[PDB]
Amino acid sequence: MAEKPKLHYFNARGRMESTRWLLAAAGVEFEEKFIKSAEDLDKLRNDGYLMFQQVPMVEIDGMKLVQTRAILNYIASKYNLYGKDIKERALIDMYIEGIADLGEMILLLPVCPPEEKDAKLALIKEKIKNRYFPAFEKVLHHHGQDYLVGNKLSRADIHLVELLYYVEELDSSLISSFPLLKALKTRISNLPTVKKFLQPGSPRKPP
Amino acid sequence: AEKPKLHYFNARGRMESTRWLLAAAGVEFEEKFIKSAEDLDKLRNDGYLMFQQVPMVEIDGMKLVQTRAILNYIASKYNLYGKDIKERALIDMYIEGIADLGEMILLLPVCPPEEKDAKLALIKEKIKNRYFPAFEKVLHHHGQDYLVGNKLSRADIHLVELLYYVEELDSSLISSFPLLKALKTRISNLPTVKKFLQPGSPRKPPMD
């Protein structure tokens, strides 16, 4: 049915991958429509499906949603992964915008000139070890629960675990002094819908 | 309920959209400005900053960092975030397009004093051929005075703030968009916004 969400993006991770993780974790089946030529982009534009002429775009519930955060916020709410009230959403939002800030740096490394790259990567790795991983370890340490917010699965656990996988590609030792994050990574990775999303053949896009 | 407390530099920066939103909602707030390294160090050493950065807003017993987290909370608390999940989708779509355009403008004075004319020209093209058409199209399709749900929402507030910023950047980009000009005057005459717009308000000055 026109009821499987359709994700429109290039055939890469890029700015669609966190949506791909969130839907998989919510157990939602979806289709992908890949931009592989200028004509794929022109057709979406001409059909009037791109509010600001840009992808990501997700067809969902009769809507043509653009802007990653709008897409993510809607999916999270629809599948009850956005906390139970305004205060839980503020915690989730705080946490995931920190994650998004870090992801944005990693995502913007290739734009750097060939020589800037390593110096900029080294600073990212330092922020992971000294700023971001301590902040999230502290959240889990302080309430003792198996999830970041509300004592249940939320998009914050899913976005964080996604980031732990990307950080592993940078330096597999960055998580080593953070046992609670390692346990979170394992716990979330073993959830049936996520485990299915992580074995080969599933959607999940490569680096 | 005490007044929210806004921790930032004494500048527009990444706190200004929060100032507009609170003022629009008729909410009184305090500001504590960072004017030295000592000010930042104290916030950090006190544990007030999750990721050691500002903006930070003390509100309802939380120490909220990340602009989007701050804005999302305030918008929901004062009924400026639409009436349901699909209205929030439209609002989110709109305001992230606004946020994208604002981020290019904010990141313009970090350009080398040479290739900034190129960046400024790309910005003006996107305003005229991409962003202003998109919002004019939205208003024309439904004819109503507000972006979403015939009701004031953060989307009207964030757009009109951007309209004022575009205007200081270039008086003319709005010329061929009358519904945007119309939205700007209407929102600007709401009592709370009208007050925020007069001199003496917490509205921070530009960066000339």
Residue numbers in the entry:
A (entry chain B): 1 to 207
B (entry chain A): 2 to 209
Q: Which sentences did the original study use to describe this structure?
A:
The isoenzyme hGSTA1-1 is primarily expressed in the human liver but can also be found in various other human tissues. Cytosolic GSTs are dimeric enzymes with each subunit having two distinct domains: a conserved N-terminal thioredoxin-like α/β domain and a C-terminal α-helical domain.
The improvement in the catalytic activity of hGSTA1-K141H/S142H as well as its thermal stability prompt us to investigate the structure of this mutant at the atomic level using X-ray crystallography. The mutant was crystallized in two crystal forms with four molecules (1.56 Å resolution) and two molecules (1.87 Å), respectively, in the crystallographic asymmetric unit. The analysis revealed that each monomer of hGSTA1-K141H/S142H retains the well-established structural features of GSTs, which consist of the presence of two distinct domains. The engineered amino acids are at the surface of the enzyme. The results showed that the mutant hGSTA1-K141H/S142H exhibits higher catalytic efficiency, thermal stability, and sensitivity against α-endosulfan compared to the wild-type enzyme. The double mutation K141H/S142H, according to the crystallographic analysis, results in subtle but specific changes in the protein structure, and the observed stability may be attributed to specific interactions within an amino acid network. The results demonstrate that the mutant hGSTA1-K141H/S142H depicts higher catalytic efficiency and stability than the rest of the mutants studied; the mutation S142H is likely the main contributor.
